[PDB]
Design a protein around this ligand. Structure first.
Ligand SMILES: CCCCCCCCCCCCCCCCCC(=O)O
Ligand SMILES: CCCCCCCCCCCCCCCCCC(=O)O
Ligand SMILES: CCCCCCCCCC
Ligand SMILES: CCCCCCCCC
Ligand SMILES: CCCCCCCC
Ligand SMILES: CCCCCCCC
Ligand SMILES: [Cl-]
Lengths: 259, 259
């Protein structure tokens, strides 16, 4: 079962998709997926859609929304900050918890790239009601990656205009000021339930070493990593995306279906 | 107004978005937008959503669906052919024609890249009921671009496997067999209503010369070209995207809001 859904708060409408298992009756586990920077809820080569349908096959529902300023949701990219996507995510969690078909004890979070940073922080904020966490190429170093651009041509334009063009998207100086005050590693530490990190070794956006840092600095024994050998940032191949999906589904199967 | 919509036919379910003006009610003009190859209804840097919202502002509604096999719609990419997207497009036009809010005399088509090839053929096939046509970087040379790979590494893989991996998408030999029989230039020739072609000079996917071929071989004086100087294939900058959308909205405003 796949059907479009809508969230509205503070005059903002978020547009998303919800999947529920056809066979199962009653309350089901739910995985919430957060997309990345300039991405949307379908994500690269439809990997989020494929992930939703793979979960549905094992009895696990899901929702995927576009953050405010991206995709089908309301707003322009220039209004978005990392913190405004955090507040979207809290509203998305609230939406899921309030669905009559949700098992509130079996809600999982999944995030890709900057969406992995969102997922890690929301997991920590709601550590007693998020059952499991999956991080795909999580951009915990997003603040550094943005600040590194301030000394390049982006920084000079930003100073003249208050925004920069990142390729058909208006990135506001508000985004830079907001993210420069955040430490994703610190804000994510303290989540004690099971974590799965999926990272490709040839990731040129979020270098593979970031997953080393997350295993070392953020989590304890509750986190394990699936390394996709030679894969790029979004697992852009049939074999790579299949490994990413299948490992994440089996992980969510283990953590959300029993206990 | 923006809302999710569905079409179910021949066991296939297509999923899309419909926009209606808020400030003008009753029967309104409608623009159907077709996305490109491996794209989806949001399209590159959300340009289709931005287009839908810019049309709303001038009193023009729109729909945009994911083709079967792409995005939010049903199906695997390996099930898709150019001809199956053409049949999708026929069902989308039927859907639009059957909405009570649609002015049946004021329906326009827009297509990007391979979606532009879809729009050109559909406009010609329904030439007496499509009031205006907008082509963005139209991939009328799609058959040649596919057959050009038959002598490259893709061709050798295709022969061994019956499909190729184009980056997390499975492209079937059925797609190759189907498109090798199609001449998009010939199938679009004869549409006599107004046409706008928008093309970037630095397009490296569909070379700008293709627009020269379309102006010469496909349409008469009813076609006009807007050249976006120095732009790439999907107008990936704020200024390029702004020009593409503004010129296309003013064209649809002139052609659909007449009389
Ligand atoms: C003070 C001026 C600052 C200007 C900053 C410009 C930044 C332009 C965007 C750079 C993004 C780089 C990192 C992308 C990382 C991966 C994200 C995923 O999701
Ligand atoms: C005999 C078959 C051999 C293999 C063919 C592989 C083709 C792989 C995809 C090639 C796409 C080329 C054009 C991309 C740009 C134009 C369309 C947009 O939309
Ligand atoms: C406009 C290009 C859309 C993606 C085409 C990909 C073809 C195979 C590239 C390796
Ligand atoms: C592959 C053909 C490209 C034609 C446009 C080139 C623009 C400068 C790179
Ligand atoms: C992982 C890349 C996301 C888009 C970045 C755009 C600015 C370089
Ligand atoms: C920008 C860092 C990239 C690290 C992986 C490089 C693989 C060729
Ligand atoms: Cl949608």
């Amino acid at each position: 079962m796949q059907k479009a859904v809508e969230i509205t708060y503070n005059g903002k409408t978020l547009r998303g998709m919800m999947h529920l298992p056809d066979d199962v009756k009653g309350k089901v586990p739910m995985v919430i997926m957060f997309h990345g920077f300039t991405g949307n809820k379908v994500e690269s080569h439809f990997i989020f859609v494929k992930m939703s349908r793979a979960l549905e096959k094992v009895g696990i529902g899901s929702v995927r929304f576009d953050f405010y300023g991206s995709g089908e949701s309301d707003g322009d990219f220039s209004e978005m900050t990392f913190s405004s996507e955090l507040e979207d995510a809290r509203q998305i969690l609230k939406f899921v918890k309030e669905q009559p078909t949700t098992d509130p004890e079996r809600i999982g979070l999944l995030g890709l790239s900057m969406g992995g940073a969102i997922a890690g922080i929301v997991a920590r904020e709601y550590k007693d009601e998020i059952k499991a966490l999956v991080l795909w190429a999580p951009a915990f170093n997003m603040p550094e990656l943005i600040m590194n651009e301030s000394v390049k041509q982006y920084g000079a334009i930003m100073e003249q205009l208050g925004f920069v063009d990142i390729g058909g998207h208006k990135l506001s100086k508000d985004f830079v000021e907001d993210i420069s005050k955040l430490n994703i590693f610190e804000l994510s530490k303290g989540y004690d339930k099971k974590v799965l990190i999926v990272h490709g070794t040839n990731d040129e956006a979020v270098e593979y070493k970031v997953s080393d840092r997350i295993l070392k600095e953020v989590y304890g024994d509750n986190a394990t990593r699936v390394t996709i050998e030679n894969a790029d940032h979004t697992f852009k191949s049939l074999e790579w995306e299949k490994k990413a999906i299948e490992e994440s589904v089996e992980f969510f199967k283990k953590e959300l279906l029993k206990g």
